[PDB]
Structure 1
Amino acid sequence: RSLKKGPFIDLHLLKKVEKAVESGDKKPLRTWSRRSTIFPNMIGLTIAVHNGRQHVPVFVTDEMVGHKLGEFAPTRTYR
């Protein structure tokens, strides 16, 4: 629901992703930017998204492109 003038992604996460893909398979990416959009060059990486207390590991697939990172890290515990 952001305008159609381009998606948003935090710059530090962008540079982390480029350094991770250019250097081959790496460790999970620890990030707090739940608001960043999942881009096609992140397919294959597992980003550890902060959820408030932990960094939830999220293995990115082609079906996730377009979502925000926080959509795969629930912040509230309910049983």
Structure 2
Amino acid sequence: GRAVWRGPYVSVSLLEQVITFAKRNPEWWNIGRFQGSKAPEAINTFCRSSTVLPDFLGLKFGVHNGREFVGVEVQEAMVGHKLGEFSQTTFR
């Protein structure tokens, strides 16, 4: 994968989406997210190649798969992977 000494990749567009979300919901971002409350809304994105951050913990992401935005709620075990690994593009 990407060389560890060069760091991760995260898209700039994804960061802007999260920053706007935090401003809209300051109370949940600071306190609610850690007591266990669910996110008040979801963030739709096309950034399937971005890495999942633990600051994205309790966040709900709608990841595009070609047709719709598949909901993905971040868990601790999903840390370190790409958003595109949890949104399937083919169906049988």
**TM > 0.5:** yes
- The gaps in structure 1 that reach 5 residues or longer are none
Identity fraction in percent: 38
Q: Distance in 2 between matches of 1:21 and 1:40?
A: 14
TM-score between the two structures when normalised by the length of structure 2: 0.77
Instruction: Go from structure 1 to structure 2 and tell me whether the alpha carbon gap of 1:20 and 1:66 turns closer, same or farther (over 3 Å shift).
Output: same
RMSD across aligned positions (CA): 1.3
TM-score between the two structures when normalised by the length of structure 1: 0.89
- Describe the SS at the equivalent of 2:90: coil
Larger helix percent: 2
Letter matched to residue 68 of structure 1: K
4+ runs deviating over 6 angstroms: none
Could you say which residue in structure 2 is the equivalent of 1:30?
Answer: 44
Give the structure with higher Rg (CA). Answer: 2
Aligned length: 78
- The gaps in structure 2 that reach 5 residues or longer are 26-38
Could you say which residue in structure 2 is the equivalent of 1:2?
Answer: 2
